[PDB]
Every structure is written in structure tokens, then in C-alpha cells.
Amino acid sequence: NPIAVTLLTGFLGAGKTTLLRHILNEQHGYKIAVIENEFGEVSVDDQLIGDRATQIKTLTNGCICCSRSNELEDALLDLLDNLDKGNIQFDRLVIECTGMADPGPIIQTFFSHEVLCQRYLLDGVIALVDAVHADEQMNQFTIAQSQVGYADRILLTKTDVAGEAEKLHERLARINARAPVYTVTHGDIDLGLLFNTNGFMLEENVVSTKPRFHFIADKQNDISSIVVELDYPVDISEVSRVMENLLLESADKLLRYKGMLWIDGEPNRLLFQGVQRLYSADWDRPWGDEKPHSTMVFIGIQLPEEEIRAAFAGLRK
């Protein structure tokens, strides 16, 4: 039981505040620890100060509240210390990273740290997108599109006030072809909608919104999704060389990437996933009766698409 971690991101004033105020105050019964930027008007039972300056507050609803006045690593290690000593219990962790915040470095701290690698397990990146402002936000700040690109589940809110967000909808798809966009048509976001996204597990269903034809529309974005579709099996070492090079050349440009590969002389599909510089792979379920094939998505800034498709194109036998 590593603890499941959710990172809630997206641009300032999208609709998190209603969600946290729910998660913090209501007797929803979940044993959740929230690391948010700053405290605010929630019933505290008690508070704790960890070896690392982490003010860890115990709320009456049984949830745990931290500030982001800390460095992350230390709050995550203080939370664990108090967990293991028995001063707190919690099943889940939601880390707020809204505003200009970059999901990249937070995700990497989860993997690069020896301890938190074992004790925590990232489940997903949830982006909240304000339908009313997202288009301009994205047009002004790269990091508004980055946050969408790093998402496993996009939650689009304020649809009820935005006049024509068919357009936004369809641009969110171009930026991020992996994440489903769920539109919050009526009630609030159920804390449920944040969990179990399996976004950091290997996936055979790699693309959510298969790309269309319009060619000018894509150049609208600095972050985009490049989806590669192969109807041939490849040699395992050849494609290993191609990926390592591809990863080497666009390392500080890639945000996320995932694939399903048809490998030469193997009846079992090959899956891969990565975030910036860190990647993995594993053999996954049998091709059984299905047409074998390959689907990859690479999400990033200013990616050299011509060259990527070229590299995979010449894997032909």
C-alpha cells in the first residue's frame, strides 16, 4: 500500500477552491491529506509541526491539511513520519499545483526520491480548465498549455457560461490527445472524479481523441500531441535505438508520452510510458485475435515532428 497521489493543476481561478472546501470540511469519510498553497477557513481539530517545519493540520472531518509554504519533499516526508509514528492516518493525497505551477517537477520528485518512490504512488494529473478563460490563458502563458499537456483527465468547468466552447474543447484535444475531457455540465466535481485514473500505469488505449485533418489549427499551439500509427511490427533493438535518440534530442521538450508497440517476432504487445526524462516499458497482453498495430503519442513543446515520424517510418522491413 503505497499511498495514491493526485495532482490537481490548472490555471488560476478554474474551480478548485469549491472542490477543496468540499474535501476539507464535509464528512465524506475519505482519509485524505491535502497539500495546498495556503490555508483557509476549515475546522481544525489539532495541528502538528514535523521535523521539517511542516505544519500538518488534522481537520474535524478526519482529513489532513498542509500548506505549500514548505518544500514538497519535506512535507511528503513529514507526512510519512507522522503516519508511521501514528499521529495521523490518511489513504490519499491531493497536491494542489494551480496558477503558474509546473506539474513536471512535482511528478519527478515522486519518482527521484528513494523513499517517496516506495511509499507513494501517483495516480493522476487532473487539470481543471475554466471554459470562459482557458483560450486566452493558454494564448498568453505556455504553462497553461503545459498543465493541460501533463493531464490524465481534463475537467472542463463553467460550460454553462461560456458561449461557444466547442472550439476550446477541440483545442484541448489537439494539445492533449491522451486525456478525456469531462465537462461538468450540472453539479460540482465529485472528489471521485479525481481518483483512479490509472494515468501512470501502462496503457494499451493510448489515444483518447484520434487526430483529424485540419492542418492550420494545430500550429495554433506551442504544446501539442504527435500521434504515430504503425501497421508494421518493428525490430526490438532498432526501436530501442530510435526511442533513446528521440528521447535524447527532445528531452526538455517532452512532457508525456505513451505507446503500444507491435514488435517483430513477439505475439505480445509492448507498452511504454514516460514523463520528460524518465520512462519505462513492459510486455503486456497478447495480440490474440486483434490486428496487431502500433499507436504512440508524444506530448511536448516545439517537437520536431517531421523527424520523429521519419525515425519510425524507416523501421520498415
CATH superfamily of the largest domain, called what? P-loop containing nucleotide triphosphate hydrolases
What percent strand? 25-35%
Number of helices: 9
Largest sheet: 9 strands, mixed
Structural class designation: alpha/beta
What's the number of extended β-strand segments?
Answer: 14
CATH topology of the largest domain: Rossmann fold
How is the quaternary structure best described? monomer
Taking the alpha carbons of the first and last residues, their distance comes to 45 Å
> What's the domain count?
2
DSSP helix fraction: 25-40%
State Rg: 21 Å
Q: Numbering strands along the chain, what is their spatial order in the largest sheet?
A: 3-4-5-2-6-1-7-8-9
CATH class of the largest domain: Alpha Beta
| Shape estimate | globular
State the order of secondary-structure elements, H for helix, E for strand. Answer: EHEEEEHEHHEHHEHEEHEEEEH
- CATH second-level architecture of the largest domain: 3-Layer(aba) Sandwich
